[PDB]
Amino acid sequence: HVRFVFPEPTADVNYIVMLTCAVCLVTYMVMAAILHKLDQLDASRGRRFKYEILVKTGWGRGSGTTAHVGIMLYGVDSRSGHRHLDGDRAFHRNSLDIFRIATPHSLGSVWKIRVWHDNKGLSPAWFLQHVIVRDLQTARSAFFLVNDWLSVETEANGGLAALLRFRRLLVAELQRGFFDKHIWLSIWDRPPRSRFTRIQRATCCVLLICLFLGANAVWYGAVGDSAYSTGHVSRLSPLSVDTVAVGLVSSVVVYPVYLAILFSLAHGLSLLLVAVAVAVSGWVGASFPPGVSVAWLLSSSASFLASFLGWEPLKVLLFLAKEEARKVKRLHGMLRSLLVYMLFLLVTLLASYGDASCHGHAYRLQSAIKQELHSRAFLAITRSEELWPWMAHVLLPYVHGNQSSPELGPPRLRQVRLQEALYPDPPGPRVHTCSAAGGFSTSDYDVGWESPHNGSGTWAYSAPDLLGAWSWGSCAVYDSGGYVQELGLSLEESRDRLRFLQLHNWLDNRSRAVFLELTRYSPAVGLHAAVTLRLEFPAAGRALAALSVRPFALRRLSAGLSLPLLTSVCLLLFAVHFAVAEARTWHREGRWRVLRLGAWARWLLVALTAATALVRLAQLGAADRQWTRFVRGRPRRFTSFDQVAQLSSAARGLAASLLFLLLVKAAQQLRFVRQWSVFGKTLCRALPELLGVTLGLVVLGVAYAQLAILLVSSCVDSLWSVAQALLVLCPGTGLSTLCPAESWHLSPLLCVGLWALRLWGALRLGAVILRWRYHALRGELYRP
Amino acid sequence: LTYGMMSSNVYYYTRMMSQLFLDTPVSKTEKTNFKTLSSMEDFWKFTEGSLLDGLYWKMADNRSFIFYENLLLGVPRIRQLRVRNGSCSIPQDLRDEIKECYDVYSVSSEDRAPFGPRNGTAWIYTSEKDLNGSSHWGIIATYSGAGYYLDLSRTREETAAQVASLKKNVWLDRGTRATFIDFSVYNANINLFCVVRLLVEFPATGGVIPSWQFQPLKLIRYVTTFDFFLAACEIIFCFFIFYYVVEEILEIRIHKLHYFRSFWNCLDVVIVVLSVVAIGINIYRTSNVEVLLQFLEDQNTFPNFEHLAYWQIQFNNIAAVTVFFVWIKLFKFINFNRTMSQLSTTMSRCAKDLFGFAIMFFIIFLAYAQLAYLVFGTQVDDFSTFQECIFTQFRIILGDINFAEIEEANRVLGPIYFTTFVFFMFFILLNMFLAIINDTYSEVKSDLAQQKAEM
Amino acid sequence: MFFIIFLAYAQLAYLVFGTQVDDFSTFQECIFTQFRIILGDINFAEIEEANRVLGPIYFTTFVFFMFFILLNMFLAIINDTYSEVKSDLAQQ
Amino acid sequence: MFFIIFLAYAQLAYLVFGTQVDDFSTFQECIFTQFRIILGDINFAEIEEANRVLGPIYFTTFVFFMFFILLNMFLAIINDTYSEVKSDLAQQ
Ligand SMILES: CCCCCCCC/C=C/CCCCCCCC(=O)O[C@H](COC(=O)CCCCCCCCCCCCCCC)COP(=O)(O)OC[C@@H](O)CO
């Protein structure tokens, strides 16, 4: 009673599966190029241990023939193969060839060696001591020869002729095919003279990965007619019986098709099979609630780990040489670095683009909130007596005027007194932002103003909260403290409270701030929005309005194993790994190396990753705390949410910056192509000249900005003739508004200077340098 | 053929229609028009308002001539697409003060039940097949061809009464998600039908998003001599395309099995494929004029011309791309002196390096685009979508941008983004292209001149 | 070659936007609008709303192939000719 | 040389558009308007209305010969001087 059920989803798309598949395909695209380079390196060619001891035995009579010999010896992460060499004697009778080659037999000082010649005819009675090697560079052998005699071409055993037993025959293969048939950890351990091509192995590995992903996606999206495979018992938290029990089953059922291609047309067959697998995985991925994608990822990781450690380990039971070695070592290092970087990029992409559906909805939500609240009307108020009519006509119909996206919490008004009543400048010309600032009042006041009869005042201070504050006003930095008014719950009582505040001089005396802000929920898209309205009052009659609508998603730490939690812990692990690596390098390879670039980028990356992870964790914790505070009771308690929105914005910005750095580094590593290595080289070869040119440009831009603002300050109504035409203002405001009254901030100066530098063609001077450099580097790689 | 299809000034036709329907204020006292709709009450004011003024023109139940030339064919039709209450899940701790939430539009969450005073087709769901409709691909989402529809009348009084009856028994509630208005005109002076479709989207988050579409068509083609001339030219074009197909097949089959390392044979097959697609589209479209025959025998019903407009737009796009590539193909023949040959040689030699550097340039461009989308994508109205970010940066290169909006979205990282973008785009990336091109041109000219002058 | 490409783009823009934008309502109007695009004094809102696909493609492709491939070729030709002339005169 | 060509265009613009456009009413207005055009501040509406032919021709020819040929000749001089200075310093 299971059969199969078609998901039949909506038009929505899940980006986690698509991103994972895209990463898994592009990593193979890079793997193919690197492994093809290494194969062409070891395609035709390549088909301390050796010392200055007597490795020849010519005392024998008729103890040799024209053939080949080999020595098999393994050790601690060391092995060897066969040998084949000859000269002019062509391996004559009892030939004493005291010579060694640059073989990869970098074995240790262990008493395990098997030397076997080739049975060129009948059984040879040769009695040679050994290929003695004592000490050349590292003393990896022992100066002792056993001179053991074996059968025809039989592997004569020795240390640093009828033994055929499982204690020797099979135990010897415990190191022979241990890592050759282990297809996962075998891309860099392929013995030569074999028909593997090092691309079939990678193709099979990607086949396994893609089929793991496809099987898990099909199980989580199609086979769900038993326990709803969602929420009831398959919770997103690791249950140890639903996350691994599916991965193991998927691996077991996918082995039969993976074993079918092992050792032509297999390349195209595997390509089309992984194409259909990724297509079906993407098609089924749409019907994925956000709580089950993490379970699918965990199941895929567990299945890969089980395949790497569970079945493949038991699958086995069924001159110019130094530069070549250095090049292959460099290729292996590049390969592992590529794998690590690809995992890091996948983690970063999941952290940043985990929820891309809410990003489009947040913009429309905030635009609708702005347009329904009459943002233009509020931002254009200048007198402290139209705020009450604005609240009467706009805000109150918006709160109690039942409509979509309910408020979810009463509003509140918070004031700071400043206890330093200000004498206002006569109306007319503007004053420079704000001035005449003193201290912040803290005392209590009864109805009206300062008048304590029995105890504390009716308008208590309402001390600031520990967490969530610092709105960062226009020219001041505030907190979460100040006298608070609840504004009431119903519309009728709200009118009475507003009239009571108006008639009792709640704001007219000092009038520093009002801080109108509550909340707003949207369950259709599942997004909250913190709305903040502030009136900063530089002086009596001078008003500055501020409106900010910040949309966010309330993800709680108590929800379990959310995707942000997994991304944060992965980022923390990556940052720890990078920090340990760079600290080890800085401590071992000399000291005081911070004098040059390269020791700064790694620290910057570590700091960025740590900041991202910690900010995300702090946002989760703050959201959980705020929700727990609000849930316990909501008669009139406010429980603002501004800090959660600010933390979410900071985390998003940090993740975007980290992804930007990763993409830039990915662009940097394109130099490995033969003809594409020039470009970056020139960019790092013309740096001093570009720095000198940009210093000159900075001086010229500063000079122009000084000239271009000493005469636009003379705005009035007529600047000049030449200065009005031969002048540049950076894009925006084509018709100049002139008169930069208290608005000549740093940013517009940089804007106008930089844009004026471009229009006049001053930046094109860079070409004058770059071209010359490109003409020199490209001539240094053709002739020499 | 392109001059024939892009006829004389029909720009003024659609211009007058649009300015009549889009730019007219909804009322004598209001300043809002269709292009600047704000809420649902504004939509109701527009419906019984500027729309009725622009539809019926006074001159037994005489017909309506919109400009005393444009004849209103049949009657206009209004349609609504809405979702159902209960397609939306809310947290269990919040199910005390809120009871109703409506999901975003989707085919799975559509409402297919009668509502209100269930009397006619305006309160009964009609399937897409029964409406002869199709998808639209609006702005927020792609909408189905079904919904609740009403066919208006030929006179103004009856249409006004119908709209008043729809408004009195509330028809656009919080569950609605899209509204369509459709009609057509003829303008018998020239031979050119016009199809008008106005769409209003009500997103779940709130607000109103309007859009419009005015499309001219020609369905009675063979009238004058120029029409016969155009038909003859089209037949000649078909013969030319057949000849090119035969030549391509013969010259790929006999020899040259590689055939693709030239860039002058891939362009030919691209042109052939595009032209064959255009011919097939035209053949399939011109034979489906049965809607016109059905309408002409009963002129009191809504004529369905949306499919013809869609296929006309597709044909126009295909023809434009094909003619652009045909014009590009002219470079194969401009080689007739030593001056024009060396420029082609320089371009062909520098193409590889330009592509190699353009890969890196586009990677950096997309890094900037994704950073801008993630940072400014919720407050600026110009970075709301990724492709919009790409277009915004391409406009920043031209200098067509407003720096005020970007800085007020973020005091920090706002000026930094613009400054670093402009600097690294005009001081570094723009000059490497010049370096590569100049080096290639210099080496080509030098070697050509040295081998030519020393022979 | 530059004007061949310019006329190809102008014809494409005339066929695509020739009935809605009013800056491409005539072939010469298309040419003048393309010359003004270099100066960066266009709207791009009307042309993007006239065609959501093949509208922005035209603009982006035109800008890329006009500022990155065509101006640099003119300046490269001028630079090479000036250097050759100066060297020849100095040798003379 | 550039100022000679600039004055030629300024006089042509003054004689053509000098009585309708209000940006070419006097010679200095013509010069300043051309300088503003170089920095991308064209209007092109009054220019088009005042003369449907010889109005667009002036604008197109000015833009082409200013942003593709004339202003690309300073950079050639600077580049050649830089190359010669660097070569001389390296040799010495
Ligand atoms: C007063 C003492 C010093 C005053 C210093 C103030 C100077 C103010 C800044 C100048 C820029 C620095 C030198 C740049 C010249 C070298 C580079 C250069 O000229 O670029 C070319 C020409 O550009 C241009 O507009 C060129 C505009 C003119 C600049 C060329 C130098 C003229 C100097 C004539 C006499 C000098 C000797 C006498 C001085 C005592 C191509 O450009 P581009 O493709 O990007 O077109 C973009 C388009 O939007 C602008 O037309």
Ligand SMILES: *[C@@H]1O[C@H](CO)[C@@H](O)[C@H](O)[C@H]1NC(C)=O
């Ligand atoms: C909408 O559905 C809810 C149940 O989900 C119900 O309580 C409410 O009455 C409905 N609203 C109506 C009837 O308009």
Ligand SMILES: *[C@@H]1O[C@H](CO)[C@@H](O)[C@H](O)[C@H]1NC(C)=O
């Ligand atoms: C759909 O087309 C058929 C003709 O094939 C017509 O009879 C029917 O009335 C049309 N649908 C509507 C809703 O008018």
